Amino acid sequence: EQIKDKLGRPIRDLALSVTDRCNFRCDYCMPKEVFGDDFVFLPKNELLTFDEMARIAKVYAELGVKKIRITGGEPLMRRDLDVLIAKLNQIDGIEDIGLTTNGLLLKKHGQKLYDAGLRRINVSLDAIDDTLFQSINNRNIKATTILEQIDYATSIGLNVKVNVVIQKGINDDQIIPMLEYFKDKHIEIRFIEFMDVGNDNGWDFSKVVTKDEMLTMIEQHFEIDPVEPKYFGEVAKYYRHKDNGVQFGLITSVSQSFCSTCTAAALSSDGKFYGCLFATVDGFNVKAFIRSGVTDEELKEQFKALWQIRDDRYSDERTAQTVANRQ
Amino acid sequence: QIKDKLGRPIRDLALSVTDRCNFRCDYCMPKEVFGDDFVFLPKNELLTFDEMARIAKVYAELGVKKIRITGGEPLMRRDLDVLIAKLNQIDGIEDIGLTTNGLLLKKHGQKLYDAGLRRINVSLDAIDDTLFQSINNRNIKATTILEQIDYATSIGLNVKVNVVIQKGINDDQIIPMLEYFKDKHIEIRFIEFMDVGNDNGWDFSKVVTKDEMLTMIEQHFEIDPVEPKYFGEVAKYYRHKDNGVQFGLITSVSQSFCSTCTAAALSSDGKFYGCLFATVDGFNVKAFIRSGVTDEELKEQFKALWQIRDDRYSDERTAQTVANRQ
Numbered sequence: 077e078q079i080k081d082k083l084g085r086p087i088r089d090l091a092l093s094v095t096d097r098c099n100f101r102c103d104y105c106m107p108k109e110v111f112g113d114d115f116v117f118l119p120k121n122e123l124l125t126f127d128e129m130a131r132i133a134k135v136y137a138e139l140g141v142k143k144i145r146i147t148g149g150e151p152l153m154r155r156d157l158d159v160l161i162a163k164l165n166q167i168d169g170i171e172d173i174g175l176t177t178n179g180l181l182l183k184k185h186g187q188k189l190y191d192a193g194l195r196r197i198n199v200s201l202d203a204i205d206d207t208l209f210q211s212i213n214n215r216n217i218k219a220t221t222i223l224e225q226i227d228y229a230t231s232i233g234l235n236v237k238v239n240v241v242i243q244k245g246i247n248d249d250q251i252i253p254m255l256e257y258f259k260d261k262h263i264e265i266r267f268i269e270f271m272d273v274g275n276d277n278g279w280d281f282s283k284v285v286t287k288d289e290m291l292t293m294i295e296q297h298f299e300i301d302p303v304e305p306k307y308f309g310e311v312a313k314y315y316r317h318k319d320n321g322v323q324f325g326l327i328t329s330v331s332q333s334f335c336s337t338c339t340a341a342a343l344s345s346d347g348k349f350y351g352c353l354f355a356t357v358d359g360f361n362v363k364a365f366i367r368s369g370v371t372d373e374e375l376k377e378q379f380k381a382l383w384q385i386r387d388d389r390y391s392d393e394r395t396a397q398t399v400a401n402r403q
Numbered sequence: 404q405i406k407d408k409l410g411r412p413i414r415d416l417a418l419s420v421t422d423r424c425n426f427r428c429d430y431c432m433p434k435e436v437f438g439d440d441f442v443f444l445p446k447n448e449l450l451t452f453d454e455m456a457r458i459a460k461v462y463a464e465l466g467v468k469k470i471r472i473t474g475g476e477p478l479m480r481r482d483l484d485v486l487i488a489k490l491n492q493i494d495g496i497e498d499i500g501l502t503t504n505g506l507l508l509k510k511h512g513q514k515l516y517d518a519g520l521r522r523i524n525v526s527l528d529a530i531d532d533t534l535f536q537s538i539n540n541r542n543i544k545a546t547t548i549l550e551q552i553d554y555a556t557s558i559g560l561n562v563k564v565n566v567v568i569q570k571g572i573n574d575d576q577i578i579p580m581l582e583y584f585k586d587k588h589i590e591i592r593f594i595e596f597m598d599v600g601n602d603n604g605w606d607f608s609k610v611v612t613k614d615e616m617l618t619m620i621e622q623h624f625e626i627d628p629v630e631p632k633y634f635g636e637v638a639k640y641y642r643h644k645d646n647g648v649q650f651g652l653i654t655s656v657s658q659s660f661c662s663t664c665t666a667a668a669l670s671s672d673g674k675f676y677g678c679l680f681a682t683v684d685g686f687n688v689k690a691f692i693r694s695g696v697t698d699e700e701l702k703e704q705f706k707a708l709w710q711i712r713d714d715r716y717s718d719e720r721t722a723q724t725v726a727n728r729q
C-alpha cells in the first residue's frame with residue numbers, strides 16, 4: 077500500500093502522456109528542425125488505449141498513487157480524452173487529476189472535460205506579447221488566443237493555473253507584464269527556470285534567469301510577502317501581492333534542485349515506464365507486458381518492482397556535476 | 404577528478420582536533436553522559452599535527468581546498484597555532500576556518516591569527532545571559548562570548564556567528580541577536596534545529612523553519628533577499644535595507660542539501676566519515692597510518708573511500724518525512 081524507491085521516496089504521482097502529437101513546435105521542446113515534415117509520429121495502435129491507462133492507474137492507486145497528471149505532447153489533441161477523464165474519475169484512491177496543456181483547444185474540449193470530472197488545468201504560456209509568443213511556438217498562434225481560452229476555461233468552472241518558462245534574452249521581459257495581467261484575473265502564475273544541460277555537463281546558465289534574479293526584478297515593481305509552504309517539500313516558492321493577496325510562485329528547477337522529494341512516475345505515449353521526466357534510454361515496456369496477457373496481480377508486482385529499484389535524480393545529478401565543473 | 408557515488412567531488416575536510424569541550428550544551432554534550440567520570444581520548448590516541456598535515460596534503464592533491472577545524476571545542480587543543488601554520492603551507496589548501504564557542508579567544512586568538520587563521524565561526528545560541536547559561540551548563544555569560552567576539556574582530560579575524568534555533572528554548576533570541584550583530588556589522592546565521600523522530604523522519608516539534616523565521620524577521624526589520632554568491636551556496640542570504648549588513652538562514656531540515664555536499668570528516672580519534680552524521684564506525688585512518696604507509700598508499704586509500712561514498716543523511720530523513728506524511 078506504500079512503496080519506497082532506492083532513495084526512500086514513496087510513489088505518489090503518475091504523469092500520463094496521452095499522445096506524442098502537438099499543435100505547437102516550441103523551439104526548446106519540439107523544434108521543427110527535428111519534428112518537421114518528415115517526422116513520423118506513433119502509429120495509433122502503438123498508443124495505450126484508455127482502458128489500458130485506467131487499468132494501469134488502478135493498480136498504481138493500490139500502491140499509493142493519489143494524483144494523475146495528463147500530459148503529452150499536447151493532450152487535447154488526443155481524441156475523446158473526456159472518456160479517459162471519466163474512467164480515471166472512477167478509480168478509488170485517486171484524489172486529483174490535472175491537465176497540462178498549451179490551452180489552444182480549451183474552447184473546443186473544455187466542457188466535455190469538465191463534464192467527465194476535470195477541475196484543474198495548468199496552462200503553459202511563455203509570453204503575453206503576440207509577436208514574441210508566435211516566434212516561440214512557431215505555429216503562428218497568438219498569446220491573445222490563449223488568454224481567451226483561459227477566460228473560457230474559468231467561465232465554465234475549471235480552475236486555471238499558468239506556467240511560464242523564462243529564457244534569458246527571450247522572454248525575461250514578460251515577467252512583469254504576466255504578473256500584472258494574471259494578478260488582475262486572480263489567477264496563480266508560476267515562473268520556471270529554464271533547464272539546459274551544457275557540454276561539461278552540468279547546467280548551462282547562459283539562458284537561465286534564476287528564481288533569485290527573477291525575485292530582484294519583481295521587488296522593484298511590486299510589494300510582496302513570502303508565503304510559508306502549505307506542506308513539507310512543496311517545490312514552488314510562493315509569494316503574494318499585498319493588495320489583493322493573489323499568489324504567484326517561482327520554481328527553482330536549476331538553482332535549487334528537488335529530486336529528494338520526487339514522488340512521480342511517468343508513462344510515455346508509447347507506454348514505457350520512467351521514474352523521471354528526463355530519460356535518455358527506453359524504459360520497461362509496460363504496453364507489451366499488458367498486451368501479452370497478465371493478471372492484475374502480475375501487473376501490480378511488476379509496478380512495485382519498478383518503483384523499488386528506482387533511483388532517478390537527473391536534476392540533482394546535473395547539480396553535482398555543475399559543482400564539480402567549477403573545479 | 405575524484406567524485407563519489409552521487410557524483411559529488413571532495414572540496415572540504417572537517418577536521419576534529421579534540422573530543423574535549425569547556426561547555427556542556429544540552430543538545431550536544433549533555434552533562435549526563437559527559438560527567439566527571441568520563442574518560443576522553445588519551446593524548447596518544449589523538450592524531451599528531453604531523454599526521455594531520457600529512458593527511459591534509461594528500462587530500463589537497465585529491466581536490467580539497469578548505470579545512471574546517473572543530474572538535475569538541477578546538478581551542479582546548481594543544482598548541483593549535485602550530486597545526487594551523489603547517490596547514491597554511493599546503494598549497495592546495497586555500498581556506499582554513501575554525502568553529503568555536505569562542506570562550507578561549509582572548510587566550511588564543513592572537514597566536515592563531517599569527518599562524519594564518521583569518522576566519523572564525525562562533526556558535527552562540529543565546530544573547531541573553533540567563534538563557535545562555537542554562538543552554539551551556541557551565542555558567543558562561545553571553546556577555547563573555549560577546550566580548551570575545553569583539554576581541555577577535557579587533558585583532559583582524561573575520562567573524563560570523565551561528566545560532567541553532569530550538570522552538571521552546573531559543574525562539575525569542577532571533578530579533579535581539581539580529582539587532583545586536585547588525586549594529587556590529589557581523590553576519591549571523593540562524594540554523595534549523597535537526598531532530599529525528601521515532602518515525603525516522605524529521606521531528607518538527609522543536610523546529611522553527613527558515614520560512615517562519617522570515618515571517619518573524621519581516622515584522623521587525625526591512626529586508627532584501629541576497630542573490631546566492633555562487634551556485635549551490637547553502638545559506639539563504641538577506642540584507643538589512645538601511646546599512647546593508649547581511650544575515651543568513653540555513654534550511655537544515657526544511658530544504659536539505661546533501662546533493663551539493665563536498666565534505667569529508669576526520670574525527671579526533673582519527674576515523675574517516677563521509678557524513679557529519681554516521682552510525683557506522685569509519686575507516687580507521689589512524690591505525691592505517693601508524694602501520695607504515697607511503698603517501699601514494701594513503702592517497703589511493705582516501706580516493707577509494709571517497710569514490711565509494713553515498714552519504715545523504717539529511718536527504719534520507721527528508722524522504723522519510725515525505726513518506727510519513729503518507
Ligand SMILES: C[S@@+](CC[C@H](N)C(=O)[O-])C[C@H]1O[C@@H](n2cnc3c(N)ncnc32)[C@H](O)[C@@H]1O
Pocket residue numbers: 098104105147148149150151176177178199200239241268269270271272
Ligand atoms: C512537454 S509539455 C506537455 C504539455 C503541453 N503540450 C504543454 O506544453 O503544456 C510540458 C511542459 O514541459 C515544459 N518544458 C519542456 N522543456 C523544458 C525545459 N527545457 N525547461 C523547462 N521546462 C520545459 C514545457 O514548458 C511545458 O510546460
Ligand SMILES: C[S@@+](CC[C@H](N)C(=O)[O-])C[C@H]1O[C@@H](n2cnc3c(N)ncnc32)[C@H](O)[C@@H]1O
Pocket residue numbers: 424430431473474475476477502503504524525526565567594595596597598
Ligand atoms: C560540535 S560543535 C564544534 C565546534 C564548537 N565546539 C562550537 O560549538 O561551535 C559545532 C556545531 O554543532 C552544532 N550542533 C550540534 N547538534 C546540532 C543539532 N542537532 N542541530 C543543529 N546544530 C547542531 C552546534 O550548534 C555547533 O555550532
Ligand code: SF4
Pocket residue numbers: 098099100101102105106148149150178200
Ligand atoms: S506545446 Fe507543449 S508539448 Fe508542444 S512543443 Fe510546446 S511545450 Fe512542447
Ligand code: SF4
Pocket residue numbers: 334335338339340351352353354388389390391392
Ligand atoms: S529530475 Fe528529479 S525531480 Fe525531476 S522528475 Fe526527475 S527525479 Fe523527479
Ligand code: SF4
Pocket residue numbers: 424425426427428431432474475476504526
Ligand atoms: S560547545 Fe560545541 S562541542 Fe561543546 S557541547 Fe556545545 S556545541 Fe558541543
Ligand code: SF4
Pocket residue numbers: 660661664665666677678679680714715716717718
Ligand atoms: S547530512 Fe548531507 S550535507 Fe550533512 S554532511 Fe551529511 S551528506 Fe553532507
